[PDB]
TrEMBL record, chain A:
Domain of life: Eukaryota
Protein name: Uncharacterized protein
TrEMBL record, chain D:
Name the UniProt record assigns to this protein: Uncharacterized protein
Tree of life domain: Eukaryota
From TrEMBL, chain J:
Part of the intact protein present: 75 to 220 of 513
Superkingdom in the source lineage: Eukaryota
Protein name: Phosphatidylethanolamine-binding protein
Species assigned in the record: Leishmania major
UniProtKB/TrEMBL annotation, chain L:
Protein name: Uncharacterized protein
Amino acid sequence: MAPELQLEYIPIIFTRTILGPQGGFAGEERLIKREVAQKYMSEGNAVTPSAEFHQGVWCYNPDSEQYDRFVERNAEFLDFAARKRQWLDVYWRVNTGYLLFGRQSWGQGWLLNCPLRKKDIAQKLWEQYKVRVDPRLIEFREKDRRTGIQDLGHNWCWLYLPGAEELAIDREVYDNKRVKVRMHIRKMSSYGALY
Amino acid sequence: RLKKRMVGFIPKVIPRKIRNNMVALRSEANTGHMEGYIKTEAERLDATGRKLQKTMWDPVLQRYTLMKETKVRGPFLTKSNIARKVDFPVGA
Amino acid sequence: SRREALYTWWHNAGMNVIPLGVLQHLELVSRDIVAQNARKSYRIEQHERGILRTPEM
Amino acid sequence: PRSGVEWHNRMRNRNHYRHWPWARWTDDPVRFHQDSVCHRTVSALSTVANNGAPEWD
Amino acid sequence: RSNYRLHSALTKQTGLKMPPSASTACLASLRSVERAIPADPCAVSFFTTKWDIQVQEYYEKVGLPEPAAPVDEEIEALLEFHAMRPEKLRVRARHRPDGSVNMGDDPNFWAQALPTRAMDGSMQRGLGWSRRTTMGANGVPVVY
Amino acid sequence: MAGHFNPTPQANSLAATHYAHTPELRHMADGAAMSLSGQRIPLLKPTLSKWSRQLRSDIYDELLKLPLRYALHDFRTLQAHIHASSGLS
Amino acid sequence: HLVAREWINVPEMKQGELVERNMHFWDTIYNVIPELGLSYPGQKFQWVHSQEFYYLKKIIITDHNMNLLGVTPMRKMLVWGPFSYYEQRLRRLSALLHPDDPVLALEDPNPAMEDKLHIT
Amino acid sequence: VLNKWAAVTKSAPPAAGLRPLARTVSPNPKLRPADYKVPYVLRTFIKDRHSSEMQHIENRG
Amino acid sequence: SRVWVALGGKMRRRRIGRQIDVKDMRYYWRPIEPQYQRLYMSRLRIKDHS
Amino acid sequence: LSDSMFEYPVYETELDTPQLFNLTPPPDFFIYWNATDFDRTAYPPVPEDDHRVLVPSSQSPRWIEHRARLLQYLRKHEIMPHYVPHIHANVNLSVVFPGQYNTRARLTDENGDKIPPPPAQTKMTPRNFWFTAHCGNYMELTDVQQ
Amino acid sequence: QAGSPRQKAKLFHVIPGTPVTPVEKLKEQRRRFGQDRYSRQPEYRPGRNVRMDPNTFTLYATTKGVMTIRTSRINPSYKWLDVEPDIQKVYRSRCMRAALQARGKASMMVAGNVHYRAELDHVTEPHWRERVMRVPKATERFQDPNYFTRGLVPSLRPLSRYSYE
Amino acid sequence: MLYGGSRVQYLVQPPFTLHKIRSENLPPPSLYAERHDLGLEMQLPRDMHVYNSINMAIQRQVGGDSSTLGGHADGFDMGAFFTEQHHPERHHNSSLPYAKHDTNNVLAMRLFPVNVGVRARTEAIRIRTDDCLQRLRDADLCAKMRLPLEHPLPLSRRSQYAAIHRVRAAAHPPPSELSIVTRPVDRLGASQRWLPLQTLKPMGHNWSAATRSSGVRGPHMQLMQERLDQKGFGWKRKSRSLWQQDVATAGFRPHRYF
């Protein structure tokens, strides 16, 4: 409470539906950063969890553009705002993250000599971001469907987040069914490089 | 050596050096003690036409005694710090 | 939940066999097993709400 | 970060951090390695009573 | 009387106390009180008294010496530390009594109370010599 | 510091038999049995010097324990350090 | 501490003859300490009872009194009982002071010279 | 602090039970608290500190 | 073990206004750090080298 | 200021005779100490509803209060869990001592006689309160000599 | 334009989690005089049995015992230095906690677990956000001074208003 | 009150309600709290070996804090800490109140004549204490031997016939053995001549560590400011004044690698 020690993040019931990572959606309770949340309780997208809001809250529809839509949070919605959060937490975690590498690259073509496997992306997803997925969903680009990733610098590849249709999740994420995981291959000598 | 006056960081102001900013609070009990004391801004500026005074442990006597201010340079027990004799209200 | 009702039994019924060392030991575990089950039962009840932390948490 | 020379002098047992963890384990400031269970008891039959008291949680 | 334990008297007093039957007929004989007594009391209520002159007059009625208090433990140290010439306390050697090398810059360690002994103590910790040898005459260990 | 006042939990019962947590100090510490064991200047045993030949029993065990051929004199008979007037010097 | 009475039998000469005048010493204190009259509900726990004489903390009145019920513990020092548990803490402090340090200061009728106002 | 072994040591320092240290606001505008406003309590200067410090308590209860 | 104990560094020049509990660290017989012990005591060893 | 900040310690029950141990300075400025206040044996005031006359039933409200308060005092004085491990506080023990409130052992002053050893106490009474065996109280050894 | 001096190393002089004597500087903090102005807030505020030196903001323990850092539950940026005096109290548990978890019989939901503390508080005090977020009305922060003379409230503390948890 | 502030009834305040203490609630009688409650010269530095002692940078904020542990977890507020820590007072003093420091015998710094200078007092509170240490050892040595006390114990009697080994508690002698007389020379009934323990001279030390030319110089060192004639390095300025100097006489020598 003190001016020195302030809650680094606070609880929040979203009224609107914000796209960003700190954002939420209609009626879920989320601990979002303090500075961000404080310009929501003024903005009206969020309201601190008084005991009243813990049952219903008047969320927002872009149709009439006002806080009319009553979204009552019974135990059933609380099984819906969990799977819908747990889903778009994997989204905003791999989309925000920038997963690094250290590899060996003798030769001129700036070509990683032991190119990457879809095993070796789910491996650097679970390693750095703890995002546990199926490496059967990671579709590579066209340049790297043949030989694996294979080249230093910034590569990206698409991760398919399948189960997003009964969560009613669109326009609050950039792409309902994909996400761009963003590699980077920082070449290193035998001292710090593997494989 | 020359270079008698230094020039790197000539400090704006400087508390210790100011017409009477550092004052030897010598003890009024003429035990020759003194406790050098820089007059704070409460007395740096001439808030006090009176010569500063304070109560400080006089380590010689082991008693709290007066401390009248006085220039820090000078013999602290001159033939002026002799008190005129007096017969106390004790004795026959 | 009955640390008071238990001792009063021990004072007026035990006191010759059961060394109260056991009791204050018995009270120190029963206030932990109950504690941890509250921390486990909660840990299982978030794991449905989608908090998903590993064995090492 | 453990940089600095004094961390070099004291991780290695250099000049006067020669026995560095000046208080390592195996000293107790409080109970000086003597078990706190009274054996001086009124009746010798009841000396075995105090055995098993909790020294902490 | 001083070392009486309630139920430990089950041992032979003929070897522990050396009574006849009719005297300890009271305390520890057959059908003595301890036999009737259980382990646990019923009520305990205890006062505290101060030394007076009747206690001195008692040790004479008997003929034993009167027990007296020891010179306090800490009070004896206040003096043994305050009657030492300061030079016995100043930092006095390059190696603190434990073996470290007190360099400058730490004002705490400029005080070497225990005096060091450089040429002494290599038998300890290497030959299996006992820790009993280390200690001084009053029991406190010396350091090497 | 303010001490320990505003007294202990302010409960009372016949049970009242489950807590010690003496303030650490009142547990072999402020029962000041021996903390001077570490903070008292030693009184060293007799010291063998070049001139002063003071024997010590504490060292003599570390020889009386050894498996040494050529056995050693018993300690008491090895001592130069013990009836006109209760026996003369 | 200042150990003094309310009434002090001070001699005085009336018609050239010595006669005893019961002196009301109480009026001597209050003139010395004008702080005791100016009483406000916090002053008995005040730090310095008299900012003139900050040395003075208690004034032990010693006047023989005939009432049965003596003064209440608010104004009497406990002078009976074992004041400790583990050791009468006098014999501890009785170890530290030396047989050659002061216990008395008897005033001087005629002083050797202006310094010796009292003999210790 | 000077200990026993110093090259020079000092006589008896004053036991704090006499002439105590008033816990009052530091003149430094950073070391005074927030709510503290400069005390412009206009008052007839009471001379003797027995009757001065008395004002600083609230003993109507 | 021969410390060449020396006195405080700042004990005569500027006193007014220095810290209250550091105007006395100047009063103890501190050892000089051994890096100088060996320098000064080097001119004394040379008496009969080898 | 408040009355709580400045108040003489008033023990709710003075069984342990705590005034004699946990000394507190007489707060006042004028401390009246005569010479005759040496004779007086400054025992605490008698508390009414004296424990010694209670009976140790298991439903008596006073007793339950006195049952724990006694076991409260024993833990305070190192006794209950260590010296006497399993105290089955059942009976209302009151070991009255034949007491004279004497300041020291002596002979009768005026009569030039040895003080007759007081007879075996026959009844509990306020005068025989502070000479009982209570929860840690103090008794001048002169009185316990019988 | 000018020169600059080298930034000294203001880091730990013990190992956190391990035992500690009082003559050890626990941490030599930056008295962050932004540039020798007179207002700073140290990183590691003092804790149990740890006392801060005023001048150089260095924490020295006051009693020998094992040391530790308590990151504030509210904001993980503000830390205390706890020294718990008993070295046997933690050693004789560590030697168990690390002997149990070797046999795979120790639970990882321990309070001392680093990554669990976020959830640990919330199992016991489920609304602790609201207990520190709650803003107090100036009435209750200065409870009726008469309740102090009538003795209802043991002692009024008007400045201790901030919940440091 | 229903009358508009005219306080006329029940003017006499009813005395307040008493807040009792439960004496059973209190801590057990603690020996270590019996010793240090009084307040004396000092304890030991809490160190024979300097470890575990206390740091001088926190020796100000102690005094009863030997017991393990603010109004809250902590934030120190930077107020009443930095407002009491370095008060406007407590600076430019020289004698900070007796905190926890094992300085000279302050119990005996109070009991001693201020007349004597310092360096001749701290050398005399020790010779007082050095005797108070012998008086204490003799009582321990005489009592433990059941002997009536004897003060200048003869070194033959000391080391109580090989320090008898304390036959291997302590007991008073019977009151037949007691008597006021305690000097061996007076006990039996050597020369009974008496002399004090130490010589107190109201003389003041003439070497102050912070004064430059102070000290006791040799009988042939240059006395304080010899040849100087009241001026800095003034013995150089008085060289041209010399009638005739030697051929090798304190010439030019700019401190180069001096």
